[PDB]
Motif scaffolding. Structure first.
Motif, short mmCIF file in Angstrom:
data_model
loop_
_atom_site.label_atom_id
_atom_site.label_comp_id
_atom_site.label_asym_id
_atom_site.label_seq_id
_atom_site.Cartn_x
_atom_site.Cartn_y
_atom_site.Cartn_z
N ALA A 129 0.79 -1.23 0.00
CA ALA A 129 0.00 0.00 0.00
C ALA A 129 0.83 1.29 0.00
CB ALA A 129 -0.94 -0.01 1.20
N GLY A 130 1.19 1.91 1.14
CA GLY A 130 1.88 3.20 1.12
C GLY A 130 1.72 4.06 2.38
N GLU A 131 2.87 4.56 2.83
CA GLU A 131 3.00 5.41 4.01
C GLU A 131 4.20 6.33 3.78
OE1 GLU A 131 3.56 2.14 6.92
OE2 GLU A 131 2.48 3.37 8.31
N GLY A 132 4.35 7.36 4.60
CA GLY A 132 5.50 8.24 4.53
C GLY A 132 6.05 8.37 5.94
N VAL A 133 7.10 7.61 6.27
CA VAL A 133 7.65 7.59 7.63
C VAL A 133 9.09 8.10 7.60
CG1 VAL A 133 8.11 6.07 9.62
CG2 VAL A 133 6.12 5.66 8.21
N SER A 134 9.80 7.62 6.60
CA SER A 134 10.09 8.47 5.46
C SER A 134 10.32 7.42 4.38
CB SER A 134 11.27 9.43 5.64
OG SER A 134 12.50 8.76 5.88
N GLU A 135 11.48 7.34 3.73
CA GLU A 135 11.71 6.36 2.70
C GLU A 135 13.23 6.27 2.62
OE1 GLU A 135 11.18 9.47 0.63
OE2 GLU A 135 9.05 9.56 0.29
N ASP A 136 13.84 5.37 3.38
CA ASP A 136 15.26 5.08 3.31
C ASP A 136 15.27 3.56 3.10
OD1 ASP A 136 16.27 7.89 3.66
OD2 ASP A 136 15.20 7.67 5.53
N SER A 137 15.99 2.63 3.75
CA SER A 137 15.89 1.21 3.41
C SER A 137 16.03 0.13 4.51
CB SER A 137 16.76 0.90 2.15
OG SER A 137 17.78 1.82 1.74
N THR A 138 16.71 -1.02 4.28
CA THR A 138 16.79 -2.19 5.19
C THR A 138 17.29 -2.05 6.63
OG1 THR A 138 18.01 -2.90 3.27
CG2 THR A 138 16.93 -4.62 4.63
N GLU A 139 17.94 -0.92 6.84
CA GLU A 139 18.08 -0.45 8.19
C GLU A 139 16.76 0.11 8.70
OE1 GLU A 139 21.05 2.83 7.81
OE2 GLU A 139 20.95 1.85 5.90
N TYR A 140 16.22 1.18 8.11
CA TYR A 140 15.27 2.07 8.75
C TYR A 140 14.13 1.42 9.53
CZ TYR A 140 10.59 2.96 7.10
OH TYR A 140 9.22 2.84 7.03
N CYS A 141 13.54 0.35 8.99
CA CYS A 141 12.63 -0.45 9.79
C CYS A 141 13.25 -1.79 10.19
CB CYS A 141 11.30 -0.64 9.07
SG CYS A 141 11.50 -1.41 7.44
N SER A 142 13.63 -2.49 9.17
CA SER A 142 14.14 -3.82 9.32
C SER A 142 15.28 -4.07 10.33
CB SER A 142 14.38 -4.10 7.87
OG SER A 142 13.14 -4.21 7.20
N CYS A 143 16.09 -3.06 10.67
CA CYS A 143 17.20 -3.12 11.62
C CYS A 143 16.92 -2.37 12.93
CB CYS A 143 18.44 -2.59 10.91
SG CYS A 143 20.03 -2.68 11.75
N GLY A 144 17.91 -2.03 13.78
CA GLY A 144 17.58 -1.64 15.15
C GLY A 144 17.43 -2.86 16.03
N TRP A 145 17.73 -2.93 17.33
CA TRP A 145 17.36 -4.12 18.07
C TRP A 145 15.84 -4.17 18.25
CZ3 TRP A 145 20.78 -7.67 18.42
CH2 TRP A 145 20.70 -8.64 19.42
#
Lengths: 626, 626, 313
Positions: free
Chosen positions: C206-222
């Motif tokens: 679908a679509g959101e603006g959280v912002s738009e960077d990549s495999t770190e921005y959500c997928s990484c972090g503990w």
């Protein structure tokens, strides 16, 4: 004054240990000592567990930084109220040997303040129990000998290994040379400590290697591999500090890693060393290559390794010597979950009883032997004192060319060390090897019209092997023991020198009991060596056999104006043991490496081929008086 | 008279050990003891080593066979003037339990005559050292607790294993049942000794197997294979007989052959036994096959495996039980060249501290379990006490269905055992597990118009596994412990029985210090049992956990006119511990095998399926008061 | 490469083809061969303390921290405390959850094939931290907050050099502190190590603006639910150790506005920027401590707040 100096320390050592617990609600007093504390009293110190050395380095820098003969004593009253007294006596004895306001205070005799590490648990227990059996002022004397089924061959050599003077010398050598002797912060240095540390230890194990052959056994096998099991031994020593005892090793025990070092970082260190011999240099803690020289190299490898503080590199070369001691002694329990009091290799006073001791000491010797081995054999030129001819030697004991060894029963006063409570004296009657007195008669043709001044190095090796009679001198260099080393002056022509047993340059003559220290005799006013270091007299010539075993008395005469160091030091004093030990605030008086001639490679097949006209083998017998 | 009875033996045992050495110029006096003098005094007694029990069986037969009460004492004055004390106390405690002039004689308490095998070496030489530190009549109290760096999980269970009453019971059980009890030459026999010997040992190790799970560990693993290494342990016990100590085992040691038996003839005995189970018979020393019957089989497997003199065959079945003890305890040194005092499994008083103890005791239990296993499970018929309905149970401590366990600090008077010399009392303050008191309230519908007489067998097991909560009762039979066993009479209709903790049939209530004995009481007047057999009170219900761990209280009611043996014996007396131990010169009062119900196979998956209307699980908590 | 190897990676081949290095019999290797499977298998950590032990030598030849170096001058940490449902406990939970198999495997027919799993979590909580900023000037700080254990598995022993292996950075921020008594209050979410919101494949479709960077921005972090360890049902007792070092000292040129994995700035970072803090990741607890308690190591800009964690059964 130096009388009351004595009259304070030794009174505190009149029933020492219990001083350990006292009122010190705030350590803070000694900003000096403030940092020490993961060792509350009799939680038993492995001397080699690294943390406690660190804790102790706090105490060494504190205990040194003092005012005068008085403030020294106050610190020593005070810090003692909490600390592991073993460490505290080790510290006060490195001090009251070497900080310059103290001459003539003698160190309280370790055999007599801590008898437990010297005698059977049973004869401690017995003397003790006899004071509980008869509450009277009568002395008690117990015969240490014991009675039991001798299955083991090695128990024979317990004349030598387990001896009072033997084990005392051993502590005393490293009380006079501590691994943690920093030179700078303590003002001055310690002459030739690394090399002398090879040597004294080889000479011990060479006297031993004779004692093995005397018995008709082989020389002691080195701990060349780490996989290979350690021998089994029970010291029979319970410690007067707490209930416990030195947990005793069964054979068939593989070496084991430590919470400090892996047995592998040990293998690493050895490789890092052995390669540096081949490369002929060392990298100090700055990375700069200094040469593995003939002169300096051995002092600078010896500090490196021990690991002395003086050390040129610690992380790189380890402390391979000391470190092997932790692992060989906590062979029951490196992980230390169990809290068993370790094997006797953990301390320098107990160390020599346990047979594995020598397995590691040929090992370290084997490294030193590589360094000497890459150095070249001796030219005949080099071996030759020009013009003087050794026309021969012979020894006259009761007869010619035999010496005759004895047993002498003797005493050690337990009272000083443990609580008599009532009686005068609790005595342990022990039995030790000894020897007849004897002389060298040595004949010379001094061809030169001038009088010659010599240094005469005299040696004892074995003439037999365990294979047959084979005088392979390179093999014999491991066994070769220096019996004497002196200066004489030799007129032209036929000269005789006659030299009596006593005046051997390796020995203590008069030992000093705590009791004589309560009075005062005049010998020298010196310290932890005075009457306690030096090799003991009764072990000056090995047991041999009842038959009369056949040995080798090999003499060299090198030049004295060549050999004497020049410099300005003192009168005739604590130089008695100049060979195995030395003399105070002076150097080792002889130019040549301790061992000379027999430090380097011999390509020759008999000790006879090696004969220069200033060398001489006089084949002698030793017989044990049964 | 039986007073001056007391007053001769125990005076000899007063500060016992030192009367071992005395005057007796020539043995010949006791033509009787001709050939025993064959271990020189503290050449240390390792009892389980085969020869020393044989040597002791010379002593058992001698010490039994004394004319009257007087001539008994004379022999005991005299033979003592040269002999090994541990054996001497052993065989005279066997005597002054069982040779019929004795009654009202108390065996001197082993914990108090030999404290060394119970407490830390430290707290011995400490109390000792405080009498040397302050020569005054003031008592000394030392806190046994110590301060260590606890790496090991197992040190937790040292509340239970190492306990005073625990280890005393253990000697006492085999002082009341000696393996060398010959019946004929000693006139009479020993009721059910083999079976009772399975049982008491299972009940010990089942209490332990709970104590493992309470802690959140698994049940203890059996010594099923001989190759597999033994665990490491240090008892921390130096022996008061000399200076030495029980040499302590490192882990990672395989079992080693003996100068007596190879580990293989051990392996054979086991094959030769477990086969005779499959075959269902035994060959006595005459070769004749007697049946491994349902009832008798366990007494006759138990006597045999131990082995007793009652072991119908000795060469053929060995003494597999005892023999494993030599090898598991001389695990340092079977060859015995090194003369080290063995591991604590060599004696019955030390035995339970060392974790491997239980590994062998599940092993022997596994054999007994095969014999019970070839016997068939219980019919519902057999399990059913007709007509009586257990409407339920519940326990009321401070609250319902919890019991709450505590720590209790306590004392043991070293003075009796070692030489105080001066002071009143040297006390070791120890800390032990305990429990709140509690009751059973048990409700019944006795449907039958007649009053019912029952025997009520009550049990405690764990409800959890160390995996998740799984009530597999065949698995639980190893853990199942009998908490109580009584007779009550039950009128028609609703019945309640209420039963208070104290009156547990397994326990000692009153223990008795030597100080009591110095005066004398009327409780009764019996012997090595009296205030010293029985399981201890504080270990009646295992520790659980601080959370409150969840266990199983399983009751059975079987019939009392069925269960009571008929016969003619004595008043109410030393029957307090009737379950784990028994009663004197009478039988085990209950028909059924000790374990019942839980001796045999259960094919069912829950302890609930196994419910007859005369059985009842009441799920209870235990919580350790921190 | 030839001289130092790839010792880290290489140990992974050998520890994972532990069934079959020669590879004759063609078995799919142990989970250490991939980075997504790796953490289940217990040996994983045996190698990772090993490599850590090497890094620890390198940090070990570097010297301990001077009190000078440890001291943010003038600011006094008058204390901290955590308020969850109660003071100084946090309470951890189980949360059942889903993962949509459909995306990965062939549903063929149905909407969604869901695997309900069960995971550890924790209550939210705050730091309340009190300060005496003695200096007449406002202070800008960087606050490094840690969690270790207070107990050993032997008895309660606060050996901080031993604890440095356990010590975990819970948060790291910049605040500005006026003169006098200051309080900072900091809520669980805004931990600098964590992912907060992550995107299911659905949200992406679908679509959101959280912002738009990549495999770190959500997928990484503990992950959030593993922010504070389980403890025990009793309430186990741990150590919350805070440091305040200076922010004008610590700032790397440019503070980043845009959250780009820089929600998780600590364990991970931020995008096309540096690790914002001067000091070695670990600080204070990178180097040797000669001191025997975490209390001896206290500067007036450090603070242990002993806290409990309890697993809600």
């Amino acid at each position: 004054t130096v009388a009351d100096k004595q009259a304070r320390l030794m009174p505190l050592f009149k029933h020492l240990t219990a001083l350990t617990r006292e009122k010190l609600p705030l350590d803070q007093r000694d900003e000096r000592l403030k940092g020490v504390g993961i060792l509350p009293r009799g939680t038993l110190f492995s001397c080699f567990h690294a943390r406690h050395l660190a804790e102790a380095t706090e105490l060494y820098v504190a205990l040194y930084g003092a005012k005068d003969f008085n403030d020294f004593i106050h610190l020593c009253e005070q810090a003692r109220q909490i600390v592991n007294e073993g460490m505290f006596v080790y510290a006060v004895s490195v001090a009251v040997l070497h900080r310059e306001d103290c001459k003539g205070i003698t160190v309280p005799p370790i055999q007599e303040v801590f008898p437990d590490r010297f005698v059977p648990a049973e004869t401690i227990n017995r003397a003790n129990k006899e004071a509980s059996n008869h509450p009277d002022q009568q002395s008690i004397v117990v015969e240490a000998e014991e009675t039991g089924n001798i299955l083991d061959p090695e128990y024979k050599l317990s004349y030598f290994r387990e001896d009072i003077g033997i084990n005392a010398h051993h502590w005393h050598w490293h009380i006079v040379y501590p691994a943690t002797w920093n030179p700078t912060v303590m003002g001055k240095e310690k002459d030739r400590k690394g090399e002398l540390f090879f040597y004294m230890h080889q000479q011990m194990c060479a006297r031993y290697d004779s004692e093995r052959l005397s018995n008709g056994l082989q020389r002691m096998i080195p701990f060349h591999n780490f996989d290979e099991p350690l021998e089994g031994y029970a010291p029979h020593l319970t410690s007067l500090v707490s209930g416990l005892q030195y947990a005793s090793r069964p054979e068939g025990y593989s070496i084991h890693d430590l919470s400090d070092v892996d047995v592998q970082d040990m293998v690493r260190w050895r490789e890092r060393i052995l390669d540096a011999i081949n490369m002929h240099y060392i990298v100090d803690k700055d990375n700069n290559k200094i040469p593995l020289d003939i002169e300096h190299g051995t002092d600078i490898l010896g500090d490196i390794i021990e690991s002395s503080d003086e050390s040129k590199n610690v992380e790189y070369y380890g402390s391979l010597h000391n470190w092997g001691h932790v692992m060989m002694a906590n062979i029951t329990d490196p992980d230390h979950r169990f809290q068993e009091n370790p094997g006797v290799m953990s301390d320098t006073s107990t160390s020599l009883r346990d047979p594995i001791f020598y397995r590691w000491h040929r090992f370290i010797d084997n490294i030193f032997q590589e360094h000497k081995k890459s150095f070249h054999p001796y030219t005949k030129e080099e071996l030759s004192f020009p013009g003087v001819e050794v026309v021969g030697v012979s020894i006259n004991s009761k007869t010619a060319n035999v010496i005759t060894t004895l047993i002498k029963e003797s005493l050690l006063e337990l009272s000083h060390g443990i609580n008599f409570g009532t009686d005068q004296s609790v005595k342990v009657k022990y039995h030790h090897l000894d020897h007849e007195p004897f002389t060298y008669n040595i004949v010379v043709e001094n061809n030169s019209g001038a009088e010659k001044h010599s240094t005469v190095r005299i040696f004892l090796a074995p003439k037999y092997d365990e294979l047959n009679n084979k005088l392979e001198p390179d093999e014999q260099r491991r066994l070769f023991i220096e019996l004497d080393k002196f200066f004489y002056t030799l007129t032209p022509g036929k000269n005789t020198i006659v030299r009596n047993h006593q005046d051997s340059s390796v020995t203590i003559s008069k030992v000093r009991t705590f009791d004589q220290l309560g009075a005062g005799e005049g010998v020298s006013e010196d310290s932890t060596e005075y009457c306690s270091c030096g090799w003991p007299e009764h072990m000056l010539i090995p047991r041999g056999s009842h038959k009369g075993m056949e040995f080798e008395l090999f003499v060299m005469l090198t030049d004295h104006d060549e050999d004497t160091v020049a410099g300005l030091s003192e009168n005739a004093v604590c130089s008695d043991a100049v060979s195995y030990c030395g003399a105070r605030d002076d150097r080792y008086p002889d130019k040549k490496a301790m061992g000379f001639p027999f430090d380097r490679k011999i390509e020759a097949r008999t000790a006879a081929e090696f004969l220069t006209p200033n060398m001489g083998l006089t084949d002698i017998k030793i017989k044990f008086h049964g």
